[PDB]
């Protein structure tokens, strides 16, 4: 009855240090709809984050896209934090330019 | 090619925290174009694609009126469900509905859909014939009998064969330069050593539309589905999509692996290899 | 254009 979300953190374009891009965090396949998603920079929350309108797939599982403008560097660490009823603790997925 | 229009409703009760929320979104194929959120200060049906903004006030005002009413209807439907299932008012519950029409390439209606769910499982659905219902449990059978006697299927059939198909052709024209244009994927393979004896081969497909795509890994011409990590197709944020498929390979065997990409925006299936050069 | 809801559950 309860479905835990799948998470994917990635950039809109192949990352290039110093060049502006978009940071994405896609949560999908979850139920119920109550979910909390944060974009992190060095472990802290990024302020002006936008997200898609709640929608769902053919199997009734929900999906949301959270995103924000960002410029990748070699020092900065980016991540996605997700809270859902199926998680005993907020789940953090670090951003890897290779995935 | 083939096109479709879908509407997705979500009604969520949240006892002791606020009135039930109603969210609704509209899609043409894989492109969202309208939205409504009853939690907004001034709940309004708003545009989410450029090609729909050209519609006049009667359109936006009528859609807003309908959704405001739809929200109240699903507020009642949530209470009725508590009755049917004998559930308390303390729990949070969700009702979902997705409905819409599928055009064939000939532009005539191919199929209509109207399905509903309760707390993530099937509740009731309009069968293909657009005249009869399929109910998942005894509670939905109550709803079925009411909708049979009230001849609801007929009002839905008329919408799916009529306005739905007409507006879909209308939308498809207003935004044909993006909606009827397929964007093939920009593809490549990447190499990532895991150790001195193993590496990950990742096959990339970026910036494609629509979302439907097939990525497979072959070794010596033999599919490797059982060893392939395939991520779920994801939005890029600019209305195109991304997907990758990876296999862990032993050093030295890389060139025995091939990536095969199928996407309707492609002239032919692609066959890729890692190009280290 | 959305469909109008004509009946309750």
Residue numbers in the entry:
A (entry chain B): 1 to 99
B (entry chain A): 1 to 277
C (entry chain E): 1 to 9
Sentences reproduced from the published study:
To begin to address the structural basis for T cell mediated control of HIV, we initiated a structural analysis of an immunodominant CD8+ T cell epitope QW9 (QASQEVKNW, p24gag residues 176–184) from HIV-1 bound to the restricting HLA class I molecule B*5801. This epitope is of particular interest because the conserved Gag protein forms the essential capsid of HIV-1, with mutations likely to impose a fitness cost. Here, we report the first crystal structures of HLA-B*5801, one of the most HIV-protective HLA molecules, loaded with QW9 and its natural variants QW9-S3T and QW9-E5D.
The most interesting feature of these three QW9/HLA-B*5801 complex structures is that the conformation of the middle portion of the bound peptide appears varied, even between the two independent molecules in the same crystal structure. The side chain of QW9 residue E5 is fully buried inside the binding-groove, whereas residue S3 has its hydroxyl group semi-exposed. The genes coding for the heavy chain of HLA molecules are highly polymorphic, which determines differential peptide-presentation and TCR-recognition. The sequence variation between the HIV-1 “protective” allele HLA-B*5801 and the deleterious allele HLA-B*5301 is eight residues, which cluster on the α1-helical region of the heavy chain shown in red in Fig. 2B.
